[model samples]
Target: SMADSANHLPFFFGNITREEAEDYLVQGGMSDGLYLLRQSRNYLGGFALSVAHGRKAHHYTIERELNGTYAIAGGRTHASPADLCHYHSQESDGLVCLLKKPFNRPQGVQPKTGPFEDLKENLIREYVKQTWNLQGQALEQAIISQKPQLEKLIATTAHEKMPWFHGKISREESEQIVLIGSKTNGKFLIRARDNNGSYALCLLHEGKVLHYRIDKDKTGKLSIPEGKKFDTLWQLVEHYSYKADGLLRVLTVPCQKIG
Candidate 1:
């Protein structure tokens, strides 16, 4: 049964059987955020190269013709043999980007060169990014580890310091026209303190803090990769509107009176 099963079983690169490729695929292959393949770049079709650095010829998976100019999955290239280069076996601790065709030679050509940035740097990078994909879990636990003294410093910085700005325009006469224009879209808050000078602006999206500013000689100017820039205060309000789900407007007016 096992012999017949081999016919239908999966495989890749060279004569590597699907059964063999599966083993390498586990620890082989590179990733950006989280993927077995460098899948961000476009593939010629649905095909990519599959190979083993001969060391861990078991779980690897690629699906392209291993010829001269075939496109590698992550926009990488191969020179001659197109096999996995400088493939590290379980004996090695250095995982790298540059494969030797199989190459990012994200490290460089075969050894006898300089040194890798090493695992320490790699772990450091992960620690830096942990706050992101870790979903505050690893990050929070890490923060919890700091305990007491570090904890006290962060809390003191947050509530104790008034690290915010509150701005408003003075419209004494009716036709003062602090125009609420279309440019306000959903990403900006354009406002001016005076009619002749530059405008004082605030941001109110993404993290969505409620802040605004006014100055002596500023009328307006501002916009976001993602918030709170404006040519008008209305733009800022417009963004705040979206950030707070419209609650900002109804409450802001009422809240302003209290402050």
Candidate 2:
């Protein structure tokens, strides 16, 4: 019905009263807005103008005479089956109508495909090997460089009592300060207090703060015993896993920040 009456000449010649045009606009879900005559076709096709803030509109033309076929001869070019009667919104108004059908791709070429599969498979294999092989050499060098900074942060004294800095008198306190468990040897947790009295926990490994957590109430606690200094941070993470709430519990934060 829209296609039949859309480009009736009476609409343009003032022969169709403004009241009639307003009625059509109301029926088409068009609210009170200024619309411009963008483009149109008489008996064969039709187009018009409309605008929406932060939105787009699309016009589709179905050739009823062409046996359930459609074509996108106006605004943006999109891909669609010839028999499917549909269209898409243009990014903005004041533009020409877009064609519903995109030009055909060459034979043997894929549509909307990307190279990520090939790239990801190759990169995953290569990166794992490279990372694993250099573990001792690269990691040892990194530890050597980071040891001094960690010591410095620990040695710095505070005039006021800080939750993060506790005298290593008890074994539990000492282990908290310096994780000595087999799985937590190179990890430390930094508790930074904000102005609101809330604290954030940063899990550091090899002198780098690799993971962080924020607790508004600061009610959570971490405790580890002394005399076991060979433990790694991975084990500490597992120990903390059971403490999380909800069905989708997070055991450990991923180390890789970006892809």
Candidate 3:
């Protein structure tokens, strides 16, 4: 979901004040704020990236001034509680954007690589990279764990006849089946069987999956994957399918239905 939120407004490049950007975010109900940095030629065209909550604040950028203003606003807003700050550097041919949170005192005199700039860029870059790496690892593990549960949900619904052994379906006779249902108002019904013989359904939007629903019979609240649940397969289908075009992509395997 976060990635979707980010991808909606993937790239922004320009010269805008950070203040205006912050104001835009505030008006859009993204008052929580965010930090962004970019590099441009003659402070004109380059690469810009930003993070904020909601579709409104999604990758919104407005030139150079706006970029700085938005970061400053975030820092001011998060200063007392989080001390957040953002920066950008035009080094060589590439541009670097940096965000710092919970501002703290510098260990020594700030560097003047440019004018009135500080070592905060290096610090924020390091921090952001580290944080991003850690989050990526955590996400990988979460996805790995989710695969089994997802497979189990699929098995129950699509491969209900299969037996679960050693925490998984043991036989190749149990084919993976993806049920493709009619498109109503936009989305189609897609059900997948898991390795553990459970069935799960998810709404596909564009190429991404959304509104994932695991059958309650297979996943009790305890073993259910984290995040929200889908009440009906149709609901999930409609939400994502309406926007999809052409032949829908789904995974399938032939398996006998239990009933």
Q: Using lDDT, rank the candidates from best to worst.
A: 2, 3, 1
TM-score of each model, in listed order = 0.16, 0.16, 0.19
Q: Which window of 10 residues has the lowest lDDT sum in candidate 3?
A: 109-118
Which whole-number lDDT from 0 to 100 does residue 61 have in model 1? Answer: 25
lDDT of each: 0.29, 0.31, 0.30
The candidate that achieves the highest lDDT relative to the unseen native structure: 2
User: Which 10 consecutive positions of candidate 1 have the poorest summed lDDT?
Assistant: 37-46
After superposition of all CA atoms, the RMSD between model 1 and the true structure is 21.8
Global CA lDDT computed for model 2: 0.31
- Best-matching candidate per TM-score: 3
TM-score of 1: 0.16
Give the C-alpha miss distance for residue 220 in model 1, angstroms.
6.5
| Model 1 C-alpha lDDT per residue in residues 181-229, reported as the tens digit of each score | 2222123233345545334333333323333343322322333223333
For model 2, residues 1-259, the per-residue Cα lDDT tens digits are: 2232332322221112223334444444453232322222211222333322123333323222233233334433323222121333323323344332232222442322112212333343343346445455644554445544422232222211223322223333333444433333223343434444232334435443333433332222222322111122222233344343321233343222112
